[PDB]
Every structure is written in structure tokens, then in C-alpha cells.
Design an enzyme around this catalytic site. Structure first.
Site, PDB file in Angstrom:
ATOM      1  N   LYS A   1      48.154  73.659  59.979  1.00 53.37           N
ATOM      2  CA  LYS A   1      49.179  74.220  60.844  1.00 53.37           C
ATOM      3  C   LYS A   1      49.083  75.750  60.855  1.00 53.37           C
ATOM      4  O   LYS A   1      49.009  76.378  59.801  1.00 53.37           O
ATOM      5  CB  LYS A   1      50.567  73.699  60.401  1.00 53.37           C
ATOM      6  CG  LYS A   1      51.782  74.469  60.908  1.00 53.37           C
ATOM      7  CD  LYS A   1      53.103  73.786  60.513  1.00 53.37           C
ATOM      8  CE  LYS A   1      54.301  74.659  60.874  1.00 53.37           C
ATOM      9  NZ  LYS A   1      55.580  73.886  60.960  1.00 53.37           N
TER      10      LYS A   1
ATOM     11  N   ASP B   1      67.397  73.028  58.235  1.00 50.68           N
ATOM     12  CA  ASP B   1      66.738  72.820  59.540  1.00 50.68           C
ATOM     13  C   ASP B   1      65.407  72.070  59.484  1.00 50.68           C
ATOM     14  O   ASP B   1      64.661  72.025  60.468  1.00 50.68           O
ATOM     15  CB  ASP B   1      66.600  74.123  60.319  1.00 50.68           C
ATOM     16  CG  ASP B   1      67.932  74.658  60.771  1.00 50.68           C
ATOM     17  OD1 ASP B   1      68.692  73.891  61.407  1.00 50.68           O
ATOM     18  OD2 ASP B   1      68.229  75.835  60.470  1.00 50.68           O
TER      19      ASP B   1
END
Lengths: 306, 322
Positions: free
Chosen positions: A110, A234
Site C-alpha cells: 500500500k 476510524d
């Protein structure tokens, strides 16, 4: 054994070269009796500046940087990952499709920001001690390596994780779940071949049994509680479903190595559909809080399995 | 497996690391059909900046540059040297002294510290030198160049040229000479003469009445190699090279060995593989003492004229042996 680092992009070739280089180098460094505080502030930096030499696939000039290599090598070991296999997964063929995957789908690569790297350094020690404590048996992202690539003067940061999904089994449904308010998937998103459904998509419409529910919910409470300690939120629960029967239209139906596909769990025998589930926590780096977010996340994930 | 690159000085650690690194990288470069002009102007550069990492033996910060690695790889091949053997001779244990004359732990290769002019000269001569090495199949008394590097430690640059050893990597040299053929005086200093293994010169060999007994087959082969090597040197602007001559006493070694095993107590022989010790000649059957010689041309990088120097060199060296 002649490793060209052929790739669709120079950046990817540099990544391949870099994992290769750093992994080798580490094969010349003794595995210590323990990590030391300095390892959590350490790095390797390399600047290549070749001329008229080996420029078939690699650029003549580039930079590679590995953050905290002793720590990530120790993490790799704790996750039962051999340095050599890791290396081979990156170098044997170009990683594929910002989110990338090694050619063998074992590892996700990523792209991140400078701030993700800082955050990572901020949680790394506590993260490591938690991994030690839970014997690597966790639902959190499993971080394998962290790198900074400098190609054409442009800095790119990368984090390597074990894939949440199976590296072989096709995923037929994706959900991203926060337990949050409210959120769904868009026409824009429900359009894709692989829609990232969400909380409202899921509640609108998981069968692992009570023992699996026990151990999974145990793992989750421990991980989410650790995440609240670090005051993180989150993040999501990434959930993927493989419908065994659907795939049937060397080999092995619903077959998989759970030492490799670490987040995979099969359907209870009295399940309506023959299915394999993949569930992990993601997005832990970048009017509520951890305690509220954590506990709500937990409520939600709990009323997801039977 | 775990190569620590441990050494007496940081510079040697960087060398070991550097050879290891460059040979490995070359392992991921296809061996080509024929070397290209680009290969003679090429180089690899690497800058290592490690922070709180791998700093037991290596400097945290250092630079390693290899000159023309395709060409020296090919030279290694043409000299019957396998890259992995090379790399292992450098990495398995620290190179030892003999900067600025070093040997690998196993006595196979020599590491010379040279100037930037020397590196530049190597570059001037490298294409023609490679061509010569090709057309003579590696059979030469010239220095056999195996690699050329620049090391940077603490801002400071050091250049090195690696060569195959003139001497045997097992057989111990009991007396050595540097010969030029110079009409001018060539003598060993009281300094050099006081040394354990002095390096004697022209008038030292003449006065000692030294001669080497190889018998004419060996001698003709040798004089032919020499003739062509020296003509090749004269083709370029080359002059003031020397013939390094090592003498190994078979009996004397046997005695040394005896004393070694006899100390252990209280606390083949004169053979050699000519594929490895490449400058080595056995003494003739009908010769006084059993010796093994090592004869090579050295010092070719840095009133009389090079052609003339070549013929004169050749004559003196004809007379050196029977």
C-alpha cells in the site's frame, strides 16, 4: 537465479530490487537476542547511481530506504513468514494491481503518506510488544516491511502487509464495516465488479459457530482494546466472502492452507451456503472517540456472526 | 551465510562488503554475447547511509564504486576464475597485509592500492588489454586484472586494483626478485635487505649467480609468452615494468612443516595446480635443489625507448634461466 526486475513501471522494479537488497543484507545480520530501543529509530538508506550499467529494467539513479528493519524482520518471524519467501514473493515477478499485491497475492503493498510513516513509528514499539504478547494471533494489519522509494526525485512511501483475503480463493462479496451515524455504498460504488459494500448494505440483507465466534470475538475485543489504548479510530473490519458452490462453476473446493490464508474461516456445517469468510481489521494508521468508537465497533461486529 | 565482513580497518570491511555486493548484483545481470563500447565506460556507484543499523563492523556511512564491471566479469571468466570463488576469497575472512598491498585470507588474489591516474590509465588501456587477453586465451605473464574499485570512508577515497597472485596460494616464497634489465644500477637497500623476505633487484641476482633450472620445454613456452606480452606492452606506451620472480624451496618448506607438527606435539610436495598457480614452473629433473618458481610481469599501469626497453627486458629474462 538471474533476477531481472522487469515491471510495468520503474518504481515497481525499484521496489523489487529494494526488497531483494534489504532482505539479503539482513541475511548478513545476526538475529539478535532481543530488539533494543534503537532498532525502533533505525533505518537503512541506499543511493544507486549507475552509469551505462544494468539499465534494462532499473533506472540508473534511485534511492531505497527501509524503516526499522530489525523490527520488521522480527515481525515477519512472528507472523510465521520466512524472509526468503517474502523476498521471493516480491522479486520473482512484478507485483500487481494505490493498492498493489505481489504476483502470488500473498502480500499487499500500500502506498502511504509521510504522516502514515510517522504514525507507524509512533505506534511501532507498543505494536511490537502487543504482537509478541498475542503470539502473532491477531486481527490487526500484519506489517511486514516499510519503505521509502525515491525515483526520478519523487518520494513514494510503502507499507507491506499480509493480504486480508485468501491468495487463491476468489472473494465474491466485500464489506467494509465501522459500526458507525450511517454510511452505504454509492451507485458509483455499487457499479464496480467488486463493490465495497458497507454497514447499511450489510444490515439490509455470517455463520461460523459458537466456538469460532468465541475466539474471533476474543481476538477482536483484545485488538480493538489495544487500538483504543493508542487512542486510534476510524479503522474498519474488512470482510470478504467466498461462495464455495459458485466457484465450482489441483484443485480443491473451499480448500486452503490456514497457515497462509490467516484470516480465513469456514462455514459452520449447518450453514445455509457453503462459504469461506475473511475478516480482519484495517486502516489503523491514518463526534466520537476510541472508547465510543471501539466499543460501538465491537457491538456491531458481534452482531455479525452466528 | 551470515557474512560479518569483520576486519582490522573499516576500509577492509567496506571492500569485503563491496565485492560481495557487486558480485551478487552481477549475478542478476545476464552474461552477454560480446562486450559493448558502453561496457568500457561504465560503472556502478552505491551510497550506504545506515542509521542505528548494521554498524558492528561496517561504517554507518560509506560509498562503493566498481569500474567497468561487465568487462572485469568477463576477464574473470577468461582467466578461469568463478565469480563465486572470487567473492568468497574476499568475504570469508579479512584481506591481510603484504592498504597498500593486500592479499585475500586464502592467498589467491592481490589487492593493490593505486592512484586516480592509474585508474585513468587502466581505462585507456582496458579495451586493448581485454582484446589481448582474448587472443591469447588468458595465457599471459601480464598482470591478470580481476576488478577495479573506489572506496569512500570518511570523505576519503581509495582506489584498488585486484589481481591474480603471482605467487602460489599454498607454496611459500623463500626468496623474491624484481628484475628490469636496466643497465643502470638496480640494488636492494639495507632497509629492504634487512626485511624478512627482501625484494632483490638486478645486481642482486647477477652477483648471487642465481639461475633457475626449468629445462627447455618450460623455457620455450615461457620465453614465447614473454615475447608476446612485452611486444604488446611496447605497442602501447609501456615501459619500466618488471619481472617478479619468486623462489620456493621444496626441502625448506618440508623442514618448516616438520617443525610445525613437532611443536604441536609438545603443546603433493612441491606440486601445484597450474590452473590456479598460473605463473608457476617446476625445477628441471637434472637440477640442483628442488625449487618451484613464480615468474610474472608486474607494474604496467603507471632515456631509453619502450620498444628498446621491450627487447632488452626480453634478453635479460632469456638469460635469467636455463
Amino acid at each position: 537465479k538471474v533476477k531481472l526486475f522487469r515491471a510495468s513501471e520503474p518504481i515497481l522494479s525499484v521496489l523489487m530490487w529494494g526488497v531483494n537488497h534489504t532482505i539479503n543484507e539482513l541475511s548478513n545480520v545476526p538475529v539478535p537476542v532481543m530488539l533494543m530501543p534503537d532498532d525502533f529509530k533505525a533505518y537503512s538508506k541506499i543511493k544507486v547511481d549507475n552509469h551505462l550499467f544494468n539499465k534494462e529494467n532499473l533506472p540508473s539513479r534511485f534511492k531505497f530506504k527501509e524503516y526499522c528493519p530489525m523490527v520488521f524482520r522480527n515481525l515477519r518471524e512472528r507472523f510465521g513468514i520466512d524472509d526468503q519467501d517474502y523476498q521471493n514473493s516480491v522479486t520473482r515477478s512484478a507485483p500487481i494491481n494505490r493498492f498493489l499485491t505481489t504476483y502470488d497475492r500473498r502480500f499487499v503493498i500500500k502506498t502511504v503518506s509521510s504522516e502514515d510513516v510517522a504514525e507507524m513509528h509512533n505506534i511501532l514499539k507498543k505494536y511490537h510488544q502487543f504482537i509478541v504478547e498475542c503470539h502473532g494471533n491477531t486481527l490487526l494489519p500484519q506489517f511486514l516491511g516499510m519503505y521509502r522509494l525515491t525515483v526520478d526525485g519523487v518520494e513514494t512511501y510503502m507499507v507491506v502487509t499480509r493480504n486480508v483475503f485468501s491468495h487463491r480463493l476468489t472473494v465474491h462479496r466485500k464489506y467494509d464495516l465501522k459500526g458507525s451515524v450511517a454510511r452505504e455504498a454509492s451507485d458509483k460504488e455499487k457499479a464496480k465488479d467488486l463493490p465495497t459494500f458497507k454497514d447499511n448494505d450489510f444490515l439490509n440483507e455470517l455463520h461460523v459457530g459458537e466456538e469460532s465466534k468465541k475466539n474471533f470475538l476474543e481476538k477482536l475485543k483484545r485488538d480493538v482494546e489495544f487500538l483504543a489504548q493508542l487512542k486510534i479510530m476510524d479503522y474498519s473490519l474488512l470482510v470478504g466472502i467466498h461462495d464455495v458452490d459458485r466457484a465450482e462453476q489441483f484443485f480443491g473446493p473451499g480448500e486452503f492452507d490456514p497457515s497462509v490464508d490467516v484470516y480465513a474461516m469456514k462455514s459452520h456445517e449447518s450453514s445455509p451456503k457453503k462459504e469461506v469468510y475473511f475478516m480482519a481489521i484495517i486502516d489503523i494508521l491514518t463526534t466520537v472517540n476510541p472508547e465510543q468508537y471501539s466499543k460501538r465497533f465491537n457491538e456491531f461486529m458481534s452482531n455479525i456472526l452466528t
